[PDB]
C-alpha cells in the first residue's frame, strides 16, 4: 500500500519527528501488514505507549495510541525497617522513577521485586501492593503499601563430621549466633551470606592452625521453617589426621637474596603444621623484598603431603617483579580536612620507589583517626611510562562532634554521672577540643581540653587543659576536709618505639582547704607551712598556689585492650614543685600489670599487678595531705572498705560546729573529752606498696558457646600504706604508722563481663589479715560507663 502522508493520533510527549524517525515506514513507500506490525511493535518497544493501533483511513495511515500515563509521584506507606530514600534508590535502579511512564502490566513484577529485596534483608513473609491513582492530563501516581511481617532468626547452627572439637567450641568463634542472653553483649541472631562465608573461613583457619591440612568443607545447607520465622544452618566437613611439617624448600627468582631468606624458613623439624606461621613467612619475605625495592613480590605456598608418614613439605615459589616508582599521591573527598592531616599519616613517600605494604599501612592509619567513614585506594598508572604510578586515596568524611551523657554505679563512687561535648577535627586541622565533666558521691570535676597531635612532624603533641575540682572527704571514707581547686596544665608527648611513650609538662594549681577536723597529721604540715591554727574549732581555711613540673613514661604491649591474654603494661608518673611555689614536694607513682599465659588457646592466665608510690618534701616541709596515697577497694586490695588501709586519725579535744545528740561525734569537749583520741577513719600515707597475684580460668558452668565473653579469676591481694614522718616517740600510746611491716592480705573470687547497662565486675573477698581500724567490705561491684 502506497503511503502519500503520515498522521498520528495520541502523540503528547514524544514529538512527531521522533515517531517518524523510529518508524521503518516513511511517507512515499509501499506498505503491507508486515511493515504495519513492525511499526506497531516498535512503538510498543519505545516504552512510552500502552496500546497502539495502526489502521488505514480512506487514504491516510492513521495511528491511534494511548500513551502510558506519565508518573507524577511514587509514595510509600509501611517501610518501618527500610528508609524511603534507599527504597527509592533501589526502584530507580530497577528503571521506574519520576518523569517516566507506568507500564500497566508490570505491577506484579515490581511487587515481586520489592518482595525479593525484603527476602534479601531478612523478612520472608512480606506483602507488597501497588495501588494506582489516575490524574488528569494522563498522569498517574503509584502508591506502594508494604506489610513487613516478622523477621527470621537463627534457631540452630550445627556441624557434622567433627569428632575432635565440640560444635560449641567452634561456634564460640563465629560472628553468627544462635543464643543471645539478656546479660551479655555477644551479637544479634540474624542471617547474612557475608557472615556465613566469614565463619566458614574462621572454621577452616581453626582447623588448619592445628595440623589438619586435609580439612575440607563438603557443603553447607540453609533451611527455613514452613512458617518462615526460623532459620537452620548445617555444615558438613571432613577433618583428616594431623600432619607434621618436615621441611621447607624455596625456589624462584630470589634476586640473589637466597641468604636473607633461609633464616626466615627455619623451623624445628617435626613441628605441627600451621597456616598462620606459613602466612607469616610469606609476609616476612614480602616485607624483605619490599625493603629491597620490589613492589609486587608474589609468593605462593604449595604443600606436598605424605599420608604414609603424615609429613607435610612446603614448597615456596617467589616471583620478585619489577620496581615501580611513585610520581604523585592524591587525596579526593577532603572538603573539610586539609591535605597535611591526611599526608602526615602516609608511610609511603612521594618521589620514591613503591611498597604496597606501606600503602596499606597508610590506609589503616587513616582509618584509625575516625574522621572518615570509608577509605579506598587506587594505584593508577601514568600515560607513557611503565615504571611510574600515581596513588589515590578516596575518602568519605564523617561528623566529628559528639554530645555525650553517661551514668554508672559502684560501691566506691556510689552513683557517677558524666557529660561532655567533644570535637576531634576543629575546622579540618587535627586539633581536638573538648569540655567534659564528672560528678560522684565525693567529687566534681570539670575540664576544658585542647591538643595538637602534631606539634612536630615526627608525631610530637602539645596539650592544654583547664580544670576545676571540688572534693569532699567525709564522703570518701576519710577525715573531714573540703578542697576546692582550680588550675591549668600543658604537656608534650614523645613517641619513641610504638609502645613506649614519654611525656613532660608544666602546671599551675590553686587549692583552697576548708572544713578541717583537728588532727595531728594535719598540723604536722600546717606548722611546717608557717600556720598556727586552733584545735578547739574547725573554722579553718588555707589557700595555696603551686607550680609543678610533671613527667611520665608509659609502656604498652598488651595483645588486646579487652580481656588480654599476654603482655605487660607499665606507667610511671612523677611531679615536683619548682621554686616560687608555696609548697615544696616531690611525688612518684608506678603502676604495673603483667599477663602471662600457660596454654596455647589462652584460657588459663597468670596476672600480676603492682602499685608503688612515694612522696616527700624538701625544705624541711612535709607533703600535702591532699596528695597522699590511699589503698583499699576494688582496684588495689579487695575485701576492704575504700580508702581505709593505712594510718588513722588522732583527733584533738575540740568543740563541734552544731551539737545535736543522737549523732556520733569525734571527740568533742561536749562529751567528756580531755585528751587525744584514736579513730578508725583513714587519712592516707606518703608511702604505698600494693601487689596482686591473680589466676584467670574459664567459666565452668556457663555454656562454652559464649563462655569466652565472661572472665573468672581467683585472686590474692596484698597492700600497705604508711607515713614516714610519724614520730613514734612523742605519741607513744598510739600505734606506729611508720611501720610498713603491717601488710594487709585478702583472697577471693572475681567475675567480669560486658552488659547492656555497661561493663560489670563483681568480687567476693575475705581478708584474713587485718589490723585494728581497717573496715571490711567483702562484696563489691561496679556497673561502669
Amino acid at each position: 500500500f502506497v503511503v502519500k502522508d503520515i498522521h498520528f493520533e495520541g502523540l503528547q510527549r514524544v514529538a512527531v519527528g521522533a515517531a517518524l524517525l523510529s518508524m521503518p515506514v516513511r511517507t512515499g513507500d509501499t506498505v503491507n501488514d508486515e511493515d504495519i506490525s513492525n511499526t506497531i511493535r516498535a512503538l510498543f518497544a519505545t516504552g512510552n505507549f500502552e496500546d497502539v493501533r495502526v489502521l488505514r483511513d480512506g487514504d491516510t495511515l492513521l495511528v491511534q495510541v494511548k500513551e502510558r500515563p506519565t508518573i507524577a509521584s511514587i509514595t510509600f506507606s509501611g517501610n518501618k525497617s527500610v528508609k524511603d530514600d534507599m527504597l527509592k534508590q533501589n526502584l530507580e535502579a530497577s528503571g521506574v522513577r519520576v518523569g517516566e511512564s507506568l507500564d500497566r502490566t508490570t505491577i506484579a513484577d515490581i511487587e515481586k521485586g520489592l518482595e525479593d529485596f525484603y527476602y534479601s534483608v531478612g523478612k520472608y513473609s512480606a506483602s507488597v501492593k501497588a495501588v494506582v491513582t489516575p490524574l488528569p492530563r494522563n498522569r498517574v501516581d503509584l502508591k506502594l503499601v508494604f506489610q513487613e511481617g516478622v523477621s527470621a532468626e537463627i534457631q540452630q547452627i550445627n556441624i557434622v563430621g567433627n569428632h575432635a572439637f565440640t560444635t560449641d567450641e567452634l561456634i564460640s568463634h563465629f560472628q553468627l549466633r544462635d543464643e543471645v542472653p539478656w546479660w551479655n553483649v555477644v551479637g544479634d541472631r540474624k542471617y547474612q551470606k557475608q557472615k556465613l562465608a566469614g565463619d566458614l573461613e574462621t572454621l577452616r583457619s581453626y582447623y588448619l592452625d592445628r595440623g589438619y591440612a586435609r580439612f575440607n568443607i563438603d557443603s553447607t545447607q540453609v533451611s527455613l521453617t514452613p512458617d518462615k520465622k526460623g532459620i537452620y544452618v548445617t555444615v558438613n566437613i571432613t577433618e583428616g589426621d594431623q600432619y607434621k611439617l618436615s621441611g621447607v624448600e624455596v625456589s624462584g627468582n630470589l634476586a640473589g637474596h637466597s641468604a636473607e631468606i633461609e633464616q626466615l624458613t627455619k623451623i624445628e623439624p617435626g613441628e605441627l603444621y600451621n597456616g598462620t606461621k606459613v602466612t607469616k613467612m610469606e609476609d616476612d619475605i614480602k616485607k624483605l623484598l619490599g625493603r629491597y625495592g620490589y613492589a609486587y613480590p608474589r609468593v605462593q605456598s604449595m604443600p606436598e603431603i605424605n599420608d604414609a608418614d603424615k609429613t607435610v613439605k612446603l614448597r615456596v615459589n617467589v616471583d620478585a617483579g619489577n620496581r615501580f616508582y611513585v610520581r604523585k599521591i592524591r587525596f579526593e573527598g577532603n572538603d573539610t580536612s586539609k591535605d597535611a592531616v591526611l599526608r602526615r599519616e602516609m608511610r609511603q613517600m612521594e618521589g620514591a620507589w613503591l611498597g604496597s605494604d606501606l600503602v596499606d599501612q597508610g590506609k589503616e592509619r587513616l582509618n584509625r583517626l575516625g574522621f572518615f567513614e570509608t577509605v579506598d585506594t587506587d594505584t593508577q598508572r601514568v600515560p607513557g611510562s611503565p615504571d611510574q604510578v600515581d596513588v589515590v586515596y578516596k575518602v568519605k568524611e564523617r561528623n566529628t562532634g559528639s554530645f555525650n551523657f553517661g551514668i554508672g554505679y559502684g560501691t566506691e563512687s556510689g552513683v557517677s554521672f558524666q557529660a561532655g561535648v567533644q570535637q576531634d577535627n576543629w575546622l579540618g586541622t587535627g586539633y581536638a577540643v573538648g569540655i567534659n565533666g564528672t560528678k560522684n558521691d565525693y567529687q566534681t570535676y570539670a575540664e576544658l581540653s585542647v591538643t595538637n597531635p602534631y606539634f612536630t612532624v615526627d608525631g610530637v603533641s602539645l596539650g592544654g587543659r583547664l580544670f576545676y575540682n571540688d572534693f569532699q572527704a567525709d564522703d570518701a571514707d576519710l577525715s573531714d576536709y573540703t578542697n576546692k581547686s582550680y588550675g591549668t596544665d600543658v604537656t608534650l608527648g614523645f613517641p619513641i618505639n610504638e609502645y613506649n611513650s614519654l611525656r613532660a609538662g608544666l602546671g599551675y594549681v590553686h587549692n583552697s582547704l576548708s572544713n578541717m577536723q583537728p588532727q595531728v597529721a594535719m598540723w604536722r604540715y600546717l606548722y611546717s607551712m608557717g600556720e598556727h591554727p586552733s584545735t578547739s574549732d574547725q573554722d579553718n581555711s588555707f589557700k595555696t598556689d603551686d607550680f609543678t613540673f610533671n613527667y611520665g613514661w608509659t609502656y604498652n604491649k598488651l595483645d588486646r585492650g579487652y580481656f588480654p591474654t599476654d603482655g605487660s603494661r607499665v606507667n610511671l608518673t612523677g611531679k615536683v614543685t619548682i621554686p616560687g611555689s608555696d609548697n615544696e614536694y616531690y611525688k612518684v607513682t608506678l603502676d604495673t600489670a603483667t599477663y602471662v599465659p600457660i596454654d596455647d588457646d589462652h584460657k588459663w592466665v597468670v596476672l600480676g599487678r603492682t602499685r608503688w608510690g612515694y612522696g616527700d618534701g624538701l625544705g624541711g616541709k612535709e607533703m600535702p595531705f591532699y596528695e597522699n596515697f590511699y589503698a583499699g577497694g576494688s582496684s588495689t586490695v579487695r575485701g576492704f572498705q575504700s580508702n581505709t588501709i593505712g594510718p588513722k586519725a588522732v583527733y584533738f579535744p575540740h568543740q563541734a560546729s552544731n551539737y545535736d545528740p543522737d549523732y556520733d561525734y569525734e571527740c568533742a569537749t561536749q562529751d567528756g573529752a580531755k585528751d587525744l583520741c584514736k579513730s578508725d577513719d583513714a587519712v592516707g600515707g606518703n608511702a604505698m606498696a600494693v601487689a596482686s597475684l591473680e589466676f584467670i580460668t574459664p567459666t565452668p558452668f556457663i555454656s562454652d558457646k559464649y563462655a569466652n565473653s565472661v572472665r573468672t579469676s581467683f585472686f590474692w591481694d596484698m597492700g600497705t600504706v604508711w607515713d614516714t614522718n610519724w614520730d613514734s616517740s612523742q605519741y607513744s600510746g598510739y600505734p606506729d604508722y611508720s611501720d610498713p611491716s603491717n601488710i594487709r592480705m585478702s583472697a577471693g573470687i572475681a567475675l567480669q563481663w560486658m552488659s547492656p547497662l555497661g561493663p560489670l565486675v563483681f568480687s567476693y573477698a575475705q581478708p584474713f589479715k587485718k589490723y585494728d581500724g581497717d573496715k571490711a567490705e567483702q562484696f563489691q561491684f561496679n556497673i561502669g560507663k
Binding site: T400, F403, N404, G406
Partner: peptide
C-alpha cells in the same frame, strides 16, 4: 550506661 550523639 554511656549514650553518645554525634551532632
Amino acid at each position: 550506661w554511656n549514650w553518645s550523639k554525634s551532632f
